Design a protein around this ligand. Structure first.
Ligand code: HEM
Ligand code: HEM
Ligand code: HEM
Ligand code: HEM
Lengths: 146, 141, 141, 146
């Protein structure tokens, strides 16, 4: 995916302020709360009965950190997302059989979490740059389907 | 379907929007136009640049419709019937685009109302906007 | 919303299915499993091969639910309430998958009922299956 | 997209029996009838007021023939759909701004039209091969978006 230099600047500048220990778990937790069918893939994580249970679940926070790490890796290789996400694509498509629509949903939940954390700093043009990013990640993660 | 808690959450969160209602509607539209440029073609008679009086006025209309839906949340198909006819028949709005604007409304609320945008309220707002979208796409002919 | 003509079209087309109801349901499931292999994971206790007695029996259940919806087309949220709870709560079926099965049901009807599958009836059947899908995805919690 | 030899065989054998003067117009007409918002892109085609009007419209039949021709071209280049659809992608994405979900819809309407025409010959495994094809075409036509 192609970001302008202005968009790259906006994206990288904001990402440097991201709390990498928390934002991923917040995005994964909100996915599980907002789109409850995604809990199907996380039976082994234990207590997901309430939103508080989900958000405070240590396994959700730990797995969220790995997800964010993958987004971070994508931001470093915007011109080669397919190669970057090849193994993850094999995992999520061939092994897990997650419908790729959910990759789009998690990307959009991440965008909501960034908006929540950064407030007015998450301007409409900053969002538009991040939408290019999370679309790119979703399409690359979906590569084994197409 | 919206639960009692969903209706409570949506009413509470939308209650915090206040005199910013029109402003937030306008910002959600701008977010949509910039993030998802396909949506721009519905507004050729609009200047879609930042500070556009037309986008500002349209944001107020979108907010007034959402406020109507909140105020009549148990009777939304009826309350939004005219708007459903408009979007599906006259304007022929692609149903995908309601998901795009709904997402941009969530982003706008998150950016403005950090205390209100809890995971539970995020879920309720998503269900509410999906319900509004379901009504507005219900009349394709 | 389903128009009077939609309800007439759906009742007429489904009337032609007859004793093949269960058979067509089973074929639509098979089409879905082969075309969209992600959907297979919902049925690990099923042998999904051709001629599977389990797919045959499940096709009859799917057809009986659709027949129930046709017979109670003005009261579908009520008629399908238990099935909605099942698919959304217990089974956690991804909403995308209803679009996939609905498409496979249309393909099955087209392959069997060439005289009935006119453009108008195709449109009515699509709206009907989307309405069924809307009810079956209405209970996510 | 990768089809097995058995799937390639099934696809090519059926496609040879397709009426290339009619099937495309039938698919485009049914798209316009079943998904009426798509009529937004065809104001210049005239009478689209009823299903009979749409299906009998000479412009719908003629434009449908071009669409089918593009599907035929894709079937000949299954291992290079991106290049095959590059100009069409530019047209439909950059110039027309058609939401790519509609590319998926038209592909699925084509599958319904094939089922209608071929009946029991359009077996579940034949369909599954055609679903790979129309997904591939939709993804390639959508390339300018991602
Ligand atoms: C942009 C979207 C996504 C990204 C970047 C992502 C990233 C990751 C990463 C980094 C891992 C760890 C893999 C490892 O341990 O080596 C993982 C595992 C996993 N993901 Fe995701 N994921 C995404 C979407 C999803 C979605 C939507 C679901 C389900 C609704 C899902 C279900 C899972 C599961 C169940 C695992 C555990 C697999 C295992 O441990 O064997 N993922 N994902
Ligand atoms: C939450 C969803 C939505 C709400 C509440 C909403 C609300 C409204 C309202 C209140 C109006 C003005 C009605 C009037 O003046 O009679 C309107 C008009 C319009 N809407 Fe929406 N809308 C929604 C989604 C969309 C989407 C997704 C699109 C397209 C991407 C869209 C395109 C339009 C257009 C083109 C007009 C006419 C503008 C004009 O010609 O002046 N709407 N909408
Ligand atoms: C037109 C849409 C659908 C209809 C009418 C329908 C109908 C039914 C019916 C009647 C049952 C049996 C209920 C019972 O025995 O209590 C059932 C069960 C089930 N359905 Fe569906 N269904 C639909 C869509 C789907 C989809 C899209 C999926 C997943 C891809 C799915 C997955 C399942 C599963 C896993 C079961 C349980 C099977 C078992 O454990 O024995 N359904 N459905
Ligand atoms: C797999 C999906 C599709 C294929 C293969 C396809 C193919 C084509 C072809 C071959 C043309 C003729 C281009 C030319 O004259 O050189 C065309 C034009 C056009 N298409 Fe499609 N199309 C697809 C989907 C769609 C959809 C879903 C829409 C709208 C809902 C659409 C709207 C149009 C319009 C308006 C034109 C006329 C453009 C012009 O003459 O300037 N297309 N398409």
């Amino acid at each position: 995916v192609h970001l302008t230099p202005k968009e790259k600047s906006a994206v990288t500048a904001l990402w440097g302020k991201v709390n990498v220990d928390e934002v991923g778990g917040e995005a994964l937790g909100r996915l599980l709360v907002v789109y409850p069918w995604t809990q199907r893939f996380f039976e082994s994580f234990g207590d997901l009965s309430t939103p508080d249970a989900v958000m405070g679940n240590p396994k959700v926070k730990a797995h969220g950190k790995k997800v964010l790490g993958a987004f971070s890796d994508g931001l470093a290789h915007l011109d080669n997302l397919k190669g970057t996400f090849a193994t993850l694509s094999e995992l999520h498509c061939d092994k897990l059989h997650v419908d790729p629509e959910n990759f789009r949903l998690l990307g959009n939940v991440l965008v909501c979490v960034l908006a929540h954390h950064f407030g007015k700093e998450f301007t409409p043009p900053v969002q538009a740059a991040y939408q290019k990013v999370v679309a790119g990640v979703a399409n690359a993660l979906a590569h084994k389907y197409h | 379907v919206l639960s009692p808690a969903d209706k409570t959450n949506v009413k509470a969160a939308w209650g915090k929007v206040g005199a910013h209602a029109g402003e937030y509607g306008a910002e959600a539209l701008e977010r949509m136009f910039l993030s998802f440029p396909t949506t721009k073609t519905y507004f050729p008679h609009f200047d879609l640049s930042h500070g556009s009086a037309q986008v500002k006025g349209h944001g107020k209309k979108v907010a007034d419709a959402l406020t109507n839906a909140v105020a009549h949340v148990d009777d939304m198909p009826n309350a939004l019937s005219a708007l459903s006819d408009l979007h599906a028949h006259k304007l022929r709005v692609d149903p995908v685009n309601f998901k795009l604007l709904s997402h941009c409304l969530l982003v706008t609320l998150a950016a403005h109302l950090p205390a209100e945008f809890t995971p539970a309220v995020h879920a309720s707002l998503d269900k509410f906007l999906a319900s509004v979208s379901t009504v507005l796409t219900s009349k394709y002919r």
